[PDB]
Structure 1
């Protein structure tokens, strides 16, 4: 009858020429693309490989995706045959506690962010942890003698930023200090927690208690220990690293007969992941909230016949289907934000490839030719917001002085007790804290908090806005205003301009810290 080479449920001609699933009279229907009918209904035109049961080389067939006959936890974007459906799990540390191995202990909040490798593949996801260096000396407060030994504990959560869920299994994670000082190896207890970590979710959920390394109720748990020297480095760096593998267990599959979705013991993520990574182009995009979001699109590999049987994929197209971009009036953009607001970064090979395309395109500006740029399997593309400044892990650590001020340009209820203003969430990320100095009329300055670790005065308010507190480091007392004439200045510090330790001297002053003016008022009615 009609050829279905891969036996996915879709005829060959449809997969190559275009198709879509429509519903008429509450009945699913797989039809050839018909512009005059389907565009109206806002339906999506699909194309996929006739010789791949799963064009993206994932556990779900092209048919199961486009039709909805699939694990409902598979992300919407991954319901597209050309977008891979797989988990991307990494560990999130919230708080950490250090003690002397038997008060006098330390409890700091940690800000861990998922990172990306300038390196190629690694078959692993990783995150970096940043420890709060604000006020509460460490080794001192802990009374750590050179012959001592430090104990470590923390609260963590697993987070899936992928397009497919995980069942009954958690990845093994390595807690690394420095370049390769593996402190601990974190595995899941019970071997089978019997839970689920769906895409875009945390485990345990944010409304539940976090997971603790060496739990209180548990006693046999292997304690995490550092020596005197390691601890010193830990204090010198205020930074750890989680290396989480890709052991995600078995896959929940769909069963036509009764529509049941059970875990297929004969289907494992371990045997499918390495195929995705070799047949897909990877695009990473921090546009939603300065968080690195990794996506993979089925791209042709010219040297591989089976792969050259895939639909042709352009950079513009990938962005639409993967990250939900759109061109309302000819202008490709991500929720009002034009592409021109984002940088493109490639690994070596993919970069060379692009250049050859541009050259062969007689084009110099890529932004004017995204619909002409072909993607190929194994390409690695990174797309970031131009405004912000990223570290070597592509994490927003700051921005331009002008843009910062622009966000505080919207004051609300100023006082002598503190300031309050609705401030863009995007910027708060790159901010470590604020400092406020009292300036004389002749040009004198008296910072109210002259320490590198007294910047934590900013606090989110559940009303949906931030509130700066002068009292916090002013002996719980409102900022005294001698003469309402000379202005009292206030301004924030960027995370990359943030100092975490006393200078070589031992100087704990605030001076030297690069800052960005965001507030100044004479003091009187103005103040």
Structure 2
């Protein structure tokens, strides 16, 4: 009686890839019959395959601020390379070993095909012209317009483009003159309810202006010729031109080089938790600013003694998760999440509770280089300290 077992392989076809993707439109106009070209990169810049989307991955319409498939649905699969979706995306033995070791595989977006839908004047219907596409149009928008990026609404980058005058082109000098103030008014929704530019009750001086080099050289010459120094006084005397890039950010925060706010300065870090809803050893409801709500990683729970002593519960990297989102906008950070479902056993009501914060400019994912899996490599801010007999 025998018993055998065989296991073959082929070192050019060892594994097959299936990728779950989702399309986003964040512009100002819809795009029809969408087909993105996209490439799967392994490691630094070693491309496995480049796949124009087949007929299975076609989005018929992507209206702005929408998704395909919509966010309550599972993503679509991109798993073929043949023009008829019959041949998979494959990888050899060395790429498979490197992917299993280092786990680095990302997805680039090289371009997007898509059609335009125009108004038919006879019956009023809107019809998709399948000859014209958006690749013949956007390079004419990008060469005649100034660009302004702005994150004064939910700290999200919103990009607009405003038709400004190029002075060395006869057709482009026929457009109307564009100031920076009128561009801010008609592009985003700034107004002057008393005489001062405001974005929903926030003054213009609460934002700062960062330009590109050519744009900053132009703005500097405009300020020299105006005999002015502050840009905030001559906002209706700054002429925009084509191919400008202006970036307007909220002045409080610190940003990385993708312009994402991750950390504020310490005074407004402390000034965010003034009115308090729930204060018990069971939980903590709190009214926090929505702007500073998302920039922080998580809070730490410990108890301040009279002698001087703290009882660090969140002394690790894993459970710096603290939040639990409720339907009122206020998260309830209830303290039986990492405590074997127990309250804070304060043994003496002459004690104080103590809550410190972690921001993402000091948050780490790995442990330290030695054996430190603690909060020894982070920097914290003081927020919450009351006395211990009004807690219960």
- The structure-2 alpha-carbon separation of the partners of 1:248 and 1:219, relative to structure 1 and needing over 3 Å to count, comes to closer
The CA deviation at 1:349 is 0.7
The CA deviation at 1:507 is 0.7
Q: Could you tell me which of 152, 163, 173 is aligned with 2:28?
A: 163
The CA deviation at 1:524 is 2.0
The CA deviation at 1:185 is 4.8
Q: Judge conservation of contact 1:214–1:221 (CA < 8 Å) in 2.
A: no
Q: Judge conservation of contact 2:57–2:76 (CA < 8 Å) in 1.
A: no
The CA deviation at 1:442 is 1.6
SS of the residue 1:320 aligns to: helix
The CA deviation at 1:354 is 0.6
Stretches of structure 1 lacking an aligned partner (at least 5 in a row): 1-136
Q: Judge conservation of contact 2:54–2:84 (CA < 8 Å) in 1.
A: no
- The structure-2 alpha-carbon separation of the partners of 1:511 and 1:379, relative to structure 1 and needing over 3 Å to count, comes to same
Calculate the TM-score normalised by the size of structure 1.
0.65
Q: Judge conservation of contact 1:388–1:398 (CA < 8 Å) in 2.
A: yes
The CA deviation at 1:274 is 0.7
Q: Could you tell me which of 246, 250, 272 is aligned with 2:111?
A: 246
- The structure-2 alpha-carbon separation of the partners of 1:523 and 1:224, relative to structure 1 and needing over 3 Å to count, comes to farther
Give CA-to-partner distance per residue, 1:59-114, whole Å, 9 cap, x none.
Answer: xxxxxxxxxxxxxxxxxxxxxxxxxxxxxxxxxxxxxxxxxxxxxxxxxxxxxxxx
C-alpha distance in structure 2 between counterparts of 1:451 and 1:141, whole Å: 46
SS of the residue 1:249 aligns to: strand
- The structure-2 alpha-carbon separation of the partners of 1:456 and 1:183, relative to structure 1 and needing over 3 Å to count, comes to farther
C-alpha distance in structure 2 between counterparts of 1:406 and 1:452, whole Å: 26
> Comparing 218-227 with 378-387, which one deviates more in the overlay?
218-227
Q: Could you tell me which of 326, 330, 341 is aligned with 1:461?
A: 326
The CA deviation at 1:397 is 1.2
> Comparing 411-420 with 374-383, which one deviates more in the overlay?
411-420
Q: Could you tell me which of 341, 345, 348 is aligned with 2:206?
A: 341
C-alpha distance in structure 1 between counterparts of 2:239 and 2:246, whole Å: 12
- The structure-2 alpha-carbon separation of the partners of 1:284 and 1:233, relative to structure 1 and needing over 3 Å to count, comes to farther
Q: Judge conservation of contact 1:246–1:270 (CA < 8 Å) in 2.
A: no
The CA deviation at 1:246 is 3.8
- The structure-2 alpha-carbon separation of the partners of 1:147 and 1:226, relative to structure 1 and needing over 3 Å to count, comes to closer
Give CA-to-partner distance per residue, 1:378-399, whole Å, 9 cap, x none.
Answer: 0011111111110011111111
C-alpha distance in structure 2 between counterparts of 1:217 and 1:187, whole Å: 10
- The structure-2 alpha-carbon separation of the partners of 1:367 and 1:508, relative to structure 1 and needing over 3 Å to count, comes to same
> Comparing 253-262 with 510-519, which one deviates more in the overlay?
510-519
Aligned length: 391
SS of the residue 2:57 aligns to: coil
Q: Judge conservation of contact 1:416–1:479 (CA < 8 Å) in 2.
A: yes
C-alpha distance in structure 2 between counterparts of 1:139 and 1:415, whole Å: 66
> Comparing 235-244 with 174-183, which one deviates more in the overlay?
235-244
- The structure-2 alpha-carbon separation of the partners of 1:235 and 1:193, relative to structure 1 and needing over 3 Å to count, comes to closer
- The structure-2 alpha-carbon separation of the partners of 1:403 and 1:138, relative to structure 1 and needing over 3 Å to count, comes to farther
Stretches of structure 2 lacking an aligned partner (at least 5 in a row): none
SS of the residue 1:420 aligns to: coil
- The structure-2 alpha-carbon separation of the partners of 1:345 and 1:476, relative to structure 1 and needing over 3 Å to count, comes to same
C-alpha distance in structure 1 between counterparts of 2:323 and 2:7, whole Å: 27
The CA deviation at 1:462 is 2.6
Q: Judge conservation of contact 1:423–1:466 (CA < 8 Å) in 2.
A: no
Give CA-to-partner distance per residue, 1:190-221, whole Å, 9 cap, x none.
Answer: 25635211112222222323335659999989
The CA deviation at 1:282 is 0.7
The CA deviation at 1:266 is 2.8
